[PDB]
Design a protein around this motif. Structure first.
Motif, mmCIF file in Angstrom:
data_model
loop_
_atom_site.group_PDB
_atom_site.id
_atom_site.type_symbol
_atom_site.label_atom_id
_atom_site.label_comp_id
_atom_site.label_asym_id
_atom_site.label_seq_id
_atom_site.Cartn_x
_atom_site.Cartn_y
_atom_site.Cartn_z
ATOM 1 N N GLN A 18 7.046 7.407 7.368
ATOM 2 C CA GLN A 18 6.339 6.155 7.114
ATOM 3 C C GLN A 18 6.688 5.175 8.230
ATOM 4 O O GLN A 18 7.711 4.498 8.177
ATOM 5 C CB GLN A 18 6.747 5.568 5.756
ATOM 6 C CG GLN A 18 6.306 4.117 5.519
ATOM 7 C CD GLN A 18 4.789 3.931 5.508
ATOM 8 O OE1 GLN A 18 4.288 2.801 5.571
ATOM 9 N NE2 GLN A 18 4.052 5.040 5.424
ATOM 10 N N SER A 65 7.564 12.860 0.913
ATOM 11 C CA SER A 65 6.305 13.154 0.241
ATOM 12 C C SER A 65 6.565 13.616 -1.199
ATOM 13 O O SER A 65 5.802 13.283 -2.114
ATOM 14 C CB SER A 65 5.525 14.234 1.000
ATOM 15 O OG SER A 65 6.271 15.439 1.064
ATOM 16 N N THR A 120 7.398 10.561 -3.253
ATOM 17 C CA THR A 120 6.160 9.840 -3.525
ATOM 18 C C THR A 120 5.340 10.489 -4.636
ATOM 19 O O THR A 120 4.827 9.787 -5.495
ATOM 20 C CB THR A 120 5.292 9.714 -2.262
ATOM 21 O OG1 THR A 120 5.994 8.926 -1.292
ATOM 22 C CG2 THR A 120 3.956 9.054 -2.591
ATOM 23 N N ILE A 166 8.722 -0.636 -6.399
ATOM 24 C CA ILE A 166 9.702 0.300 -5.862
ATOM 25 C C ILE A 166 9.415 0.610 -4.403
ATOM 26 O O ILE A 166 8.328 1.074 -4.066
ATOM 27 C CB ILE A 166 9.689 1.646 -6.622
ATOM 28 C CG1 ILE A 166 9.981 1.431 -8.112
ATOM 29 C CG2 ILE A 166 10.725 2.584 -6.010
ATOM 30 C CD1 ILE A 166 9.936 2.719 -8.925
ATOM 31 N N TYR A 167 10.399 0.367 -3.545
ATOM 32 C CA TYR A 167 10.297 0.727 -2.139
ATOM 33 C C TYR A 167 11.163 1.961 -1.867
ATOM 34 O O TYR A 167 12.324 2.017 -2.278
ATOM 35 C CB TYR A 167 10.737 -0.468 -1.261
ATOM 36 C CG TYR A 167 10.853 -0.163 0.227
ATOM 37 C CD1 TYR A 167 9.728 0.162 0.990
ATOM 38 C CD2 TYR A 167 12.092 -0.143 0.850
ATOM 39 C CE1 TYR A 167 9.849 0.514 2.338
ATOM 40 C CE2 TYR A 167 12.224 0.201 2.190
ATOM 41 C CZ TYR A 167 11.106 0.533 2.928
ATOM 42 O OH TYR A 167 11.264 0.915 4.245
ATOM 43 N N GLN A 168 10.585 2.949 -1.190
ATOM 44 C CA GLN A 168 11.304 4.171 -0.819
ATOM 45 C C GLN A 168 11.785 4.062 0.623
ATOM 46 O O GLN A 168 11.026 3.656 1.515
ATOM 47 C CB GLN A 168 10.395 5.406 -0.886
ATOM 48 C CG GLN A 168 9.577 5.572 -2.141
ATOM 49 C CD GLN A 168 8.399 6.519 -1.921
ATOM 50 O OE1 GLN A 168 7.290 6.263 -2.396
ATOM 51 N NE2 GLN A 168 8.635 7.615 -1.188
ATOM 52 N N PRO A 216 2.295 16.167 3.952
ATOM 53 C CA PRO A 216 2.868 15.787 5.245
ATOM 54 C C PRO A 216 2.769 16.927 6.257
ATOM 55 O O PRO A 216 3.024 16.747 7.457
ATOM 56 C CB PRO A 216 4.310 15.440 4.900
ATOM 57 C CG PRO A 216 4.622 16.342 3.730
ATOM 58 C CD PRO A 216 3.328 16.529 2.964
ATOM 59 N N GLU A 247 4.829 -1.438 2.454
ATOM 60 C CA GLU A 247 5.642 -1.376 1.242
ATOM 61 C C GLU A 247 5.547 -0.042 0.499
ATOM 62 O O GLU A 247 6.466 0.334 -0.218
ATOM 63 C CB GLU A 247 5.266 -2.524 0.296
ATOM 64 C CG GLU A 247 5.831 -3.864 0.735
ATOM 65 C CD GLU A 247 5.317 -5.027 -0.092
ATOM 66 O OE1 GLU A 247 4.778 -4.793 -1.205
ATOM 67 O OE2 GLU A 247 5.453 -6.182 0.376
#
Ligand SMILES: Cc1cc(C#N)cc(C)c1Oc1nc(Nc2ccc(C#N)cc2)nc(N)c1Br
Lengths: 550, 401
Positions: free
Chosen positions: A91, A162, A165, A180-182, B47, B131
């Motif tokens: 990310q 992934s 997520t 929530i932040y990863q 991915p 975010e």
């Protein structure tokens, strides 16, 4: 645990085949540590032992963890990695605090043995085969392959993220009021619930995580949270504490680090400057080398230390209000800005100092800063700010119309915060009646670097000077400067240099060329200047008579 | 049954970073993609797909539409859509009294994309402030915006159009990307009636503005006619002809600059010579016509240069080798970026009608400024290639109107 989530399909690059590296013979005590570690990993499912068939292999090594007598297992995946397909970027981009919303309650969960908790594509596992060597290599080694994401393998961060997520989806969907932040193996959770309802939600999250193979250490701080260089509180944020050393002597290394810290502090401390410090870094010096601070650098340092003494904080973003951005001209080439929704509670601040080209004016720079700030805003908040700019509407629209490039800035208002950005001279649009016409020309010899610059006027004045180690483009600038210093307050100038004409009609108020700055000071003093171009060698009257003399 | 699709050898798929998007466009893209997903047009990807192509949302009409920037993919598939099969451009199109442009992009949504090619069509919906991870999809069907789609649907398209073409042999229909171009010499009412007729054929296979290519004439370099002439007036004149001399065979300046003798005041008036009087007359006669010696070469890219002329006026030239103008023009009628945006779409449209090709644009603006804003006004389903340039200030002068 090993997560029940589906595996990600993995292949090797299309030409290539799996690794086949030979295992280096190891010390007896490293072999022993490896056996211990692997036996434990194998009992948890992390690895399975194999026998050839399997033709692949990758080297394992073992290091003693610090002084504290634990051994760690190192695998070297260099070759498997060079051979593994590319993955999507995990990310790219991390949140800015100014973009976060306020939260009453925050907690940080970290995932235990994150990579080893995610299964590896069954079809790919063979390529992870490794071998613990026997003592002095005398008998066949013990062979394993991974069943989970190995540490050091190219695919692991992307596939772990992934997986997390996919596992978080249902919980995010059922709990839209919590956020929530990863990042890597951490989870950052925040809500506007009171400690009680919130702790309950955390537990449902952990329970949901553990249902999916991911443990999160139990229930044993409060704000502030230190995060990515920042200090987060429930309704405000700042950078983590900046400490500028006191030193009588500054190495290149010390100054680099100081500029980095100052640049970092400039996100929320208004008006940090690094121009003078950065000029010290110019040149080719060693890291350990001591650089005497110039006087301006020494003052700039002081100015900054004065700004840094007492803490400042930013606030968080309220999606229901406009963003206001204000810009001020600071030093020369230096611009500073603040962004707020309620004056003057900054969500953040910043610097702009870039030079686009050798020659510019303040209007062009202000516009570039506005462009940089607009993009920053799209990224952080998803909309553009209303601007407040130290430039008159009339000045801006005078520049925009007469300039040959397209430009545009979103909604803005004048704000009287000097220094105001101005155009410092305007070029005439028509020939000036009663103004002496200077026909100028410059020309250099290619292998000699010897030039002549001069003029003839309609009033009969003439003048040529010699220039040493010059270029053709410099002499053309010299000729124009010559005409400016020998003429009255009004003057028409005829050149054949599109180069010279390009620069000057752009209306620069600052340049890296000393010559060009001279021409500029000269242009500001004039009352009227009309600049015209003619085709050279086309036998044009005034041209091929000052071209003949030069 | 899908058509096998190959990339150009030695090239991997597109890996282009997603531009940042405003809240409202991201929302519109989520909505749209949630629907395309439920319908099977696109599916979530993992991915292990490394590729990416940018997406944007545009406002056609108040209704958000998704736009995928397939410029890289198109460039890396070029062998496929240009020279295996591939779509002939009709020379007749530019000659019709009226050409109507019909969006038929919907047609591709009903055709499967080669399973092994799908991964190259990956795109990402970004999130504000980074975010959450972007939402990732690829295509299961022929995507709008990809030059492969019309190439592949070609066979179906001529089956859909055969009846209508056979019944109206004087109408020219040309497909380019997502659009159908339809040209006739009919009176405008009869023309529109025929467009309706065509729409009805289209409608049976799943498809629910007007150009006048004649009224396209050159924008000549113009030589002012003037009461009296100043030295300055003559020098501008000489420079504009001097530069035209680079393009037009036959241009003459000699007996004109004879006037500019010695070193004279810029504002001094100088009388017009018999000689000179004839020159600019004959040069005007010359500037009126197409450039002798310049022909379109189909193996070469088209380039378009644009100049900001002020007061909402813009000049442009289309060439393949600099100064060899295939066509020149202007656009008129105040946001600079909006106007430039409009001019680019207009020029791209004419270029499509004339050559069946999109030009690469040299845009007189700041890279960063263009990229922020062009989205706000863009209304076409294609995107041309562009670079950014500083207009040589003299070039601007010599193309002024
Ligand atoms: C919950 C959280 C904790 C830490 C960490 N560490 C870092 C991040 C990026 C977090 O995510 C978010 N945090 C906030 N606000 C926030 C408010 C107060 C505090 C405090 N104290 C921390 C974060 N808003 C979001 N939209 C997201 Br997503």
């Amino acid at each position: 645990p090993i997560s029940p989530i589906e595996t990600v399909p993995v292949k090797l690059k299309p030409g290539m085949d799996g690794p086949k590296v030979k295992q280096w013979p190891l010390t007896e005590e490293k072999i022993k540590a490896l056996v211990e570690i692997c036996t434990e990993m194998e009992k948890e499912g992390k690895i399975s032992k194999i026998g050839p068939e399997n033709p692949y292999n990758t080297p394992v090594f073992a290091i003693k963890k610090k002084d504290s007598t634990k051994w760690r297992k190192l695998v070297d995946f260099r070759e498997l990695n060079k051979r593994t397909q590319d993955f999507w970027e995990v990310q790219l981009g991390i949140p800015h605090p100014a973009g976060l919303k306020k939260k009453k309650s925050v907690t940080v969960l970290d995932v235990g043995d994150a990579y080893f908790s995610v299964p590896l594509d069954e079809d790919f596992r063979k390529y992870t085969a490794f071998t613990i060597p026997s003592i002095n290599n005398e008998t066949p080694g013990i062979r394993y392959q991974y069943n989970v994401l190995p540490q050091g393998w190219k695919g692991s961060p992307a596939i772990f993220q992934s997986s997390m997520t996919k596992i978080l989806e249902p919980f995010r969907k059922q709990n839209p009021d919590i956020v929530i932040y990863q990042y890597m193996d951490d989870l950052y959770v925040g809500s506007d619930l009171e400690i009680g309802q919130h702790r309950t939600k955390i537990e449902e999250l952990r329970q949901h995580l553990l249902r999916w193979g991911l443990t999160t250490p139990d229930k044993k701080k409060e704000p502030p949270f230190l995060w990515m260089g920042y200090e987060l509180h429930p309704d405000k944020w700042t950078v983590q504490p900046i400490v500028l050393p006191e030193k009588d002597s500054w190495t290149v290394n010390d100054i680099q680090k100081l500029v980095g810290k100052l640049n970092w502090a400039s996100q929320i401390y208004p008006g940090i400057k690094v121009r003078q410090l950065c000029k010290l870094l110019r040149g080719t010096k060693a890291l350990t080398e001591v650089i005497p601070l110039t006087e301006e650098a020494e003052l700039e340092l002081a100015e900054n230390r004065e700004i840094l003494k007492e803490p400042v904080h930013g606030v968080y973003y309220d999606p229901s209000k406009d963003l206001i951005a204000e810009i001020q001209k600071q030093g020369q080439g230096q611009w500073t800005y603040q962004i707020y929704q309620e004056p003057f509670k900054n969500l953040k601040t910043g610097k702009y100092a870039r030079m686009r080209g050798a020659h510019t004016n303040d209007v062009k720079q202000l516009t570039e800063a506005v462009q940089k700030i607009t993009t920053e805003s799209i990224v952080i908040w998803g909309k553009t700010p209303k601007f407040k700019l130290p430039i008159q509407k009339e000045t801006w629209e005078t520049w925009w119309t007469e300039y040959w490039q397209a430009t545009w800035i979103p909604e803005w208002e004048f704000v009287n915060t000097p220094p105001l950005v101005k155009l410092w001279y305007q070029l005439e649009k028509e020939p000036i009646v009663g103004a002496e016409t200077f026909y100028v020309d410059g020309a250099a010899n290619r292998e000699t670097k010897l030039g002549k610059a001069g003029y003839v006027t309609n009033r009969g004045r003439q003048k040529v000077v010699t220039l040493t180690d010059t270029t053709n483009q410099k002499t053309e600038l010299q000729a124009i400067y010559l005409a400016l210093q020998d003429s009255g307050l009004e003057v028409n100038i005829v050149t054949d240099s599109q180069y010279a004409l390009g620069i000057i009609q752009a209306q620069p108020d600052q340049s890296e060329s000393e010559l060009v700055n001279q021409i500029i000071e000269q242009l500001i003093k004039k009352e009227k200047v009309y600049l015209a171009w003619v085709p050279a060698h086309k036998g044009i009257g005034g041209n091929e008579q000052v071209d003949k003399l030069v | 049954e899908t058509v096998p699709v190959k990339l150009k050898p030695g090239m991997d798929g597109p890996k282009v970073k997603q531009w940042p998007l405003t809240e409202e466009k991201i929302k519109a893209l989520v909505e749209i993609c949630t629907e395309m997903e439920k319908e099977g047009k696109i599916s979530k990807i993992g991915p292990e797909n490394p590729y990416n192509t940018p997406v944007f949302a545009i406002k056609k009409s108040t209704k958000w539409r998704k736009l995928v920037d397939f410029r890289e993919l198109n460039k890396r598939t070029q062998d496929f859509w240009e020279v295996q099969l591939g779509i002939p451009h009709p020379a007749g199109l530019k000659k019709k009294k009226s050409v109507t442009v019909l969006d038929v992009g919907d047609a591709y949504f009903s055709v499967p994309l080669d399973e092994d090619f799908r991964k190259y069509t990956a795109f990402t919906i970004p999130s504000i402030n980074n975010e959450t991870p972007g939402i990732r999809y690829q295509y299961n069907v022929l995507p709008q915006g990809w030059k492969g789609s019309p190439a592949i649907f070609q066979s179906s398209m001529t089956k859909i159009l055969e009846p209508f073409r056979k019944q109206n042999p004087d109408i020219v229909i040309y497909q380019y990307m997502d659009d159908l171009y339809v040209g006739s010499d009919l009176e405008i009412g009869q023309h529109r009636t025929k467009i309706e007729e065509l729409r009805q054929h289209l409608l049976r296979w799943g498809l629910t503005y007007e150009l006048h290519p004649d009224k396209w004439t050159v924008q000549p370099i113009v030589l002012p006619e003037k009461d009296s002439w100043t030295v300055n007036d003559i020098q501008k004149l000489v420079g504009k002809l001097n530069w035209a001399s680079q393009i037009y065979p036959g241009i003459k300046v000699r007996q004109l600059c004879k006037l500019l003798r010695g070193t004279k005041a810029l504002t001094e008036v100088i009388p017009l010579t018999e000689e000179a009087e004839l020159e600019l007359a004959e040069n005007r006669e010359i500037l009126k016509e197409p450039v002798h010696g310049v022909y379109y070469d189909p193996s070469k890219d088209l380039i378009a240069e644009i100049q900001k002329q002020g007061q909402g006026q813009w000049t442009y030239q289309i060439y393949q080798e600099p100064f060899k103008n295939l066509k020149t023009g202007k656009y008129a009628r105040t946001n600079d970026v909006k106007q430039l945006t409009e001019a680019v779409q207009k020029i791209t449209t004419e270029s499509i009608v004339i050559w069946g090709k999109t030009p690469k644009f040299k845009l007189p603006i700041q890279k960063e400024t263009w990229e922020t804003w062009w989205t706000e006004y863009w209304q076409a389903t294609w995107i041309p290639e562009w670079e950014f340039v500083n207009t040589p200030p003299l070039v601007k002068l010599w193309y002024q109107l």
